[PDB]
Design a protein around this ligand. Structure first.
Ligand SMILES: COc1ccc(CSc2nnc(CC(C)C)n2Cc2ccccc2)cc1
Length: 146
């Protein structure tokens, strides 16, 4: 199919170079250079348990893309033992072909949170990579709170 092939081109030319998370203070809480967007494998991350007590977290995402995108955006879900507890939407917008970009996002928490000791290893963050309405990939990170 025609859309399938375009999605595979975009995936092929895409790379997450690095990321970090700060208290919205700022204070780096987590950082990494592993490309967590790679689909098909379950990635793992260890975050400080005190992140659960932040009102907001500031994220920085550095990525490269050989393909042009008209509307790059993410849909991200927290899954707890298979169950979706919370969802976020983030839009970056237009991406220049063969560009490298730094993206800043403010992530806010919504209800009361289970303890870190209950959550740890039982939380999966699922990220869906879209160009407008075309799904380019799905990736997963399992979280441990340390
Ligand atoms: C296709 O574009 C991308 C870009 C980035 C990703 C990276 S995954 C990711 N992004 N934000 C968060 C945190 C928030 C809960 C949403 N996480 C998960 C996470 C949580 C803790 C430590 C490291 C990663 C995947 C695909």
């Amino acid at each position: 199919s025609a859309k399938d092939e375009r999605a595979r081109e975009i995936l092929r030319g895409f790379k997450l170079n690095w990321m970090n998370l700060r208290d919205a203070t700022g204070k780096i809480l987590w950082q990494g250079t592993e490309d967590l967007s790679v689909p098909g494998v379950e990635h793992e991350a260890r975050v400080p348990k005190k992140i659960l007590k932040c009102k907001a977290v500031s994220r920085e995402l550095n990525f490269s893309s050989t393909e042009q995108m008209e509307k790059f955006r993410l849909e991200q879900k927290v899954y707890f033992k298979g169950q979706c507890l919370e969802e976020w939407f983030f839009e970056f917008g237009f991406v220049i072909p063969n560009s490298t970009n730094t993206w800043q996002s403010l992530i806010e928490a919504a209800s009361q949170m289970m303890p870190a000791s209950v959550l740890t290893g039982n939380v999966i963050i699922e990220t869906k990579f879209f160009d407008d309405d075309l799904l380019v990939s799905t990736s997963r990170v399992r979280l441990f709170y340390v």
